[PDB]
Write a protein that holds these residues in place. Structure first.
Motif, PDB file in Angstrom:
ATOM      1  N   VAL A 192      11.775  45.467  63.390  1.00 56.16           N
ATOM      2  CA  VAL A 192      11.440  44.968  64.714  1.00 56.16           C
ATOM      3  C   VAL A 192       9.943  45.147  64.920  1.00 56.16           C
ATOM      4  N   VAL A 193       9.445  44.550  66.003  1.00 53.83           N
ATOM      5  CA  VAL A 193       8.013  44.568  66.278  1.00 53.83           C
ATOM      6  C   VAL A 193       7.504  45.993  66.440  1.00 53.83           C
ATOM      7  N   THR A 194       8.380  46.921  66.821  1.00 53.99           N
ATOM      8  CA  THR A 194       7.964  48.289  67.095  1.00 53.99           C
ATOM      9  C   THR A 194       7.555  49.058  65.846  1.00 53.99           C
ATOM     10  N   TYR A 195       7.816  48.537  64.655  1.00 51.63           N
ATOM     11  CA  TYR A 195       7.524  49.282  63.443  1.00 51.63           C
ATOM     12  C   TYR A 195       6.127  48.949  62.937  1.00 51.63           C
ATOM     13  N   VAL A 196       5.486  49.941  62.329  1.00 47.95           N
ATOM     14  CA  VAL A 196       4.131  49.773  61.821  1.00 47.95           C
ATOM     15  C   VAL A 196       4.172  49.064  60.477  1.00 47.95           C
ATOM     16  N   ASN A 197       3.313  48.067  60.320  1.00 47.77           N
ATOM     17  CA  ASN A 197       3.286  47.249  59.122  1.00 47.77           C
ATOM     18  C   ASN A 197       2.316  47.839  58.113  1.00 47.77           C
ATOM     19  N   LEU A 198       2.683  47.746  56.842  1.00 48.09           N
ATOM     20  CA  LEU A 198       1.858  48.241  55.750  1.00 48.09           C
ATOM     21  C   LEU A 198       2.419  47.664  54.460  1.00 48.09           C
TER      22      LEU A 198
HETATM   23  C1  LIG Z   1       3.985  43.829  62.413  1.00 45.26           C
HETATM   24  O1  LIG Z   1       4.148  42.521  61.986  1.00 45.26           O
HETATM   25  C2  LIG Z   1       4.850  41.665  62.891  1.00 45.26           C
HETATM   26  C3  LIG Z   1       5.018  40.353  62.160  1.00 45.26           C
HETATM   27  O2  LIG Z   1       3.897  40.089  61.328  1.00 45.26           O
HETATM   28  C4  LIG Z   1       4.077  41.566  64.209  1.00 45.26           C
HETATM   29  O3  LIG Z   1       4.811  40.855  65.198  1.00 45.26           O
HETATM   30  C5  LIG Z   1       4.460  39.451  65.213  1.00 45.26           C
HETATM   31  O4  LIG Z   1       3.326  39.163  66.042  1.00 45.26           O
HETATM   32  C6  LIG Z   1       2.955  37.776  66.008  1.00 45.26           C
HETATM   33  C7  LIG Z   1       1.686  37.645  66.819  1.00 45.26           C
HETATM   34  O5  LIG Z   1       1.962  37.599  68.212  1.00 45.26           O
HETATM   35  C8  LIG Z   1       4.104  36.909  66.526  1.00 45.26           C
HETATM   36  O6  LIG Z   1       3.758  35.534  66.397  1.00 45.26           O
HETATM   37  C9  LIG Z   1       3.677  34.953  67.717  1.00 45.26           C
HETATM   38  O7  LIG Z   1       4.963  34.820  68.302  1.00 45.26           O
HETATM   39  C10 LIG Z   1       4.924  34.370  69.667  1.00 45.26           C
HETATM   40  C11 LIG Z   1       6.353  34.333  70.180  1.00 45.26           C
HETATM   41  O8  LIG Z   1       6.791  35.672  70.387  1.00 45.26           O
HETATM   42  C12 LIG Z   1       4.223  32.985  69.755  1.00 45.26           C
HETATM   43  O9  LIG Z   1       3.968  32.690  71.114  1.00 45.26           O
HETATM   44  C13 LIG Z   1       2.894  32.954  68.963  1.00 45.26           C
HETATM   45  O10 LIG Z   1       2.411  31.620  68.885  1.00 45.26           O
HETATM   46  C14 LIG Z   1       3.028  33.576  67.585  1.00 45.26           C
HETATM   47  O11 LIG Z   1       3.859  32.711  66.832  1.00 45.26           O
HETATM   48  C15 LIG Z   1       5.383  37.191  65.746  1.00 45.26           C
HETATM   49  O12 LIG Z   1       6.475  36.495  66.335  1.00 45.26           O
HETATM   50  C16 LIG Z   1       5.679  38.688  65.730  1.00 45.26           C
HETATM   51  N1  LIG Z   1       6.853  38.968  64.917  1.00 45.26           N
HETATM   52  C17 LIG Z   1       7.490  40.146  64.918  1.00 45.26           C
HETATM   53  C18 LIG Z   1       8.680  40.250  64.014  1.00 45.26           C
HETATM   54  O13 LIG Z   1       7.115  41.089  65.609  1.00 45.26           O
HETATM   55  C19 LIG Z   1       3.776  42.956  64.754  1.00 45.26           C
HETATM   56  O14 LIG Z   1       2.891  42.861  65.864  1.00 45.26           O
HETATM   57  C20 LIG Z   1       3.156  43.856  63.690  1.00 45.26           C
HETATM   58  N2  LIG Z   1       3.040  45.216  64.192  1.00 45.26           N
HETATM   59  C21 LIG Z   1       2.323  46.170  63.590  1.00 45.26           C
HETATM   60  C22 LIG Z   1       2.331  47.512  64.253  1.00 45.26           C
HETATM   61  O15 LIG Z   1       1.696  45.959  62.556  1.00 45.26           O
END
Ligand SMILES: *[C@@H]1O[C@H](CO)[C@@H](O[C@@H]2O[C@H](CO)[C@@H](O[C@@H]3O[C@H](CO)[C@@H](O)[C@H](O)[C@@H]3O)[C@H](O)[C@H]2NC(C)=O)[C@H](O)[C@H]1NC(C)=O
Ligand SMILES: *[C@@H]1O[C@H](CO)[C@@H](O[C@@H]2O[C@H](CO)[C@@H](O[C@@H]3O[C@H](CO[C@H]4O[C@H](CO)[C@@H](O)[C@H](O)[C@@H]4O)[C@@H](O)[C@H](O)[C@@H]3O)[C@H](O)[C@H]2NC(C)=O)[C@H](O)[C@H]1NC(C)=O
Ligand SMILES: *[C@@H]1O[C@H](CO)[C@@H](O)[C@H](O)[C@H]1NC(C)=O
Lengths: 66, 50
Positions: free
Chosen positions: B39-45
């Motif tokens: 989910v978005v809450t997890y740190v990416n690496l």
């Molecule tokens: C970890 O990685 C994930 C995925 O790479 C990050 O979340 C992603 O963030 C992007 C940027 O906002 C999202 O794309 C956007 O989505 C929205 C709709 O929600 C849309 O309006 C934008 O045009 C764009 O497409 C993406 O959906 C989202 N995905 C997920 C699974 O979270 C996340 O922020 C990263 N976090 C860390 C701590 O690295």
């Protein structure tokens, strides 16, 4: 953790169990953690005997070089 | 697990402490859990820094 027998004949069998009950078993790496501090109570030892005292321990460093 | 200090100095110290008692220490690998769902809450690496 406990030491079955003593070093009188150089056989200190290291086992672990529950505090209440007697459930002997050789201590395992997954049972423990590592700390950076030491005291006299901690029995002091070299690296080569770690597999000897813990067969569950695996030294990847000293096995790869072989 | 907490990040004491901040990324302001390129040093993020990841330590695990009891929620009941602050006892910082680097966590051990045997003590985590692997998950298939992200989910978005997890740190990416990437695998390099594991
Ligand atoms: C970890 O990685 C994930 C995925 O790479 C990050 O979340 C992603 O963030 C992007 C940027 O906002 C999202 O794309 C956007 O989505 C929205 C709709 O929600 C849309 O309006 C934008 O045009 C764009 O497409 C993406 O959906 C989202 N995905 C997920 C699974 O979270 C996340 O922020 C990263 N976090 C860390 C701590 O690295
Ligand atoms: C493996 O690690 C063990 C720790 O878990 C070691 O235990 C430590 O052992 C060393 C020496 O082997 C101790 O250090 C000594 O302390 C004495 C104390 O001095 C006081 O007493 C004398 C005599 O009464 C007196 O004259 C002095 O003025 C002092 O009042 C020193 O005299 C020695 O020079 C030496 O520094 C450590 O104290 C001890 N650990 C702890 C936490 O106390 C064990 O020794 C290690 N393995 C080996 C083979 O040494
Ligand atoms: C492990 O450490 C030994 C020395 O203790 C070294 O010779 C060896 O190359 C190391 N191997 C790895 C994979 O770190």
């Amino acid at each position: 953790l406990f030491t079955h027998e003593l070093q009188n004949h150089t056989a200190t069998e290291y086992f672990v169990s529950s505090r209440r009950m007697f459930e002997p078993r050789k201590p395992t790496v997954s049972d423990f953690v590592q700390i950076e501090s030491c005291v006299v109570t901690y029995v002091n030892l070299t690296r080569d005997q770690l597999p000897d005292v813990i067969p569950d321990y695996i030294d990847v460093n000293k096995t790869r070089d072989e």
